[PDB]
Amino acid sequence: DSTECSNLLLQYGSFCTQLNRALTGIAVEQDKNTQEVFAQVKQIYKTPPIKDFGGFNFSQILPDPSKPSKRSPIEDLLFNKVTNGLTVLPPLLTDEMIAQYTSALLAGTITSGWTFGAGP
């Protein structure tokens, strides 16, 4: 909050603008990275209620309906195992929507093969 410091800082020009613009570019690059990784489908697929897959069990990777976060047991274990002018911008996609994207990808690759990645 020192005004004399900011008056002396104006002598150095647009350094602060360059630092803010570089950090803004990094911040939008992270959201672009998440968009390119997880949002590869525009249809949100669901598995059928009956899990008859010829003996194949996907309960450890399908979302658990009993959990409020709608995560798989493996994804829940993964989320449990990871632990002055400064601001932290939140990510554009929340963890619930990233879990929804992975659930859609799992439902597509279980019920439809590789056909959903190339068309209907």
Binding site: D1, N20, T24, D31, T87, L89, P90, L92, T94, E96
Partner: protein, 361 residues
Amino acid sequence: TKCTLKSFTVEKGIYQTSNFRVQPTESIVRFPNITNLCPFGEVFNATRFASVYAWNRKRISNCVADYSVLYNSASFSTFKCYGVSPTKLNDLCFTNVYADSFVIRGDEVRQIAPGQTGKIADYNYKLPDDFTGCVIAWNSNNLDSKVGGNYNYLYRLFRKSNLKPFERDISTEIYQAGSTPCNGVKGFNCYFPLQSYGFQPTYGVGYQPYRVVVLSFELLHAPATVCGPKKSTNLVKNKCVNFNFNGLTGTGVLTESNKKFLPFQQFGRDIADTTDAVRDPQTLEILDITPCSFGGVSVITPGTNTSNQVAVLYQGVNCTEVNVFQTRAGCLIGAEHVNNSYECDIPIGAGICASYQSIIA
């Protein structure tokens, strides 16, 4: 946004333009209790003052000195400083103070000065040319004077050589006015050096006895124990104020704290070495210092070819501290929140997006 982008046309998107600040409202200075005062009451208002050839030297140290009471007193007829300022005595700090108290004649009050030549200056009390401090003098005709004449106050009249600064001479050697040998035996040209004053109530102004206290300051490598008084104000909580606690200053919100300090500890630090807890010096209570709600001001707009309507996002700011909607990214003002879900046009964050159709979120 046009000012920030240096352009008269703004493309559709969100642009961080400014930085919201919760402006400090008050200044809170809390300083501890003004105890252990310097004993100026036994120097200025003592029972019996000393003579000028044997002036009493009182060492003022390890205490806080209130010079405002001494300076605002109207009884003093002379308050002249030669190395400091009278209005800055309560602000400056000194290692120790030497208080020299004596009684002189009213015409000799000017003789306690640097560069001044007189009988009191040469033979009774001498000040250096680089003297620092203040000379205080007041009339004492109602106390010291006696109708039979107060002869108790003596003064030195003769010496071979002048005094060094801050030098006493209580010797009673018989002066040699001439060149005749005197072995302590008084004669025609050999007189006793100490003569008594003639303080009587019938004399006018100039012959009345004046009590003088001279304060001299030392600025050695010893620690500055003698300092001025500290005027602590009232404490205001739950507001973004400028706090000044025992020389530690800053800006923050001062709330009640559940951290129980040990009695020797005063401040509290987190991992990142920022002061987040503190003890008030007046009342021993623990206060958390939450930083004021700084945030980024982002402007959400479509193209200026399309419309001039904008929305403002205050990042990480609750909506009660600034078409008002609360997001996890912050408070969004100017966008109507709807229950329908569309594709993301302008990203806000935490799953919130904005679009133009008015601006909806």
